[PDB]
Design a protein around this nucleic acid. Structure first.
Ligand SMILES: [Mg+2]
Ligand SMILES: [Mg+2]
Ligand SMILES: [Mg+2]
Ligand SMILES: [Mg+2]
Length: 65
RNA sequence: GAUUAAUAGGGACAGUUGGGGGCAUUAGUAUUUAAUAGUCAGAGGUGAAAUUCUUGGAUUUAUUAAGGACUAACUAAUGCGAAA
């Protein structure tokens, strides 16, 4: 099966925490996730990675995706 | 032998008030730029895009540092200064 990497600790009553940084410009949007110490990057998705037209590099749609 | 003492003016004095001024000092974020790490393909900019920047790593996140300016929010028909 899958080889996850989250620390060795599950539990449908044990919450995991990830600090999501979100910068919203009128041109581009960023969505970042990182340790609660913010020194090790995990996930990084920006509107640009989501659409073709530079004007849409902001969009509500690009934010959804 | 020298008028009063001008809701005239000059001085003394008394607590007090002010973003008045001159030297010191002292911060605070932010903008840059640099280090230390962190990823990952796009950043940035416009109505649209375009020159611009970028896996000899950008934008990005955390810590920290250097530097020059600036004093936010409180800051309002409120204050001070002859005015600037
Ligand atoms: Mg003073
Ligand atoms: Mg610029
Ligand atoms: Mg400094
Ligand atoms: Mg005042």
């Amino acid at each position: 099966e899958v080889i996850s990497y989250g620390p060795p600790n599950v539990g449908a009553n044990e919450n995991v925490f990830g600090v999501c940084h979100i910068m919203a410009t009128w041109n581009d949007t960023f969505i970042h996730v990182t340790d609660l110490s913010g020194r090790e990057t995990l996930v990084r998705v920006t509107g640009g990675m989501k659409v073709k037209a530079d004007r849409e590099e902001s969009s509500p749609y690009a934010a959804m995706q």
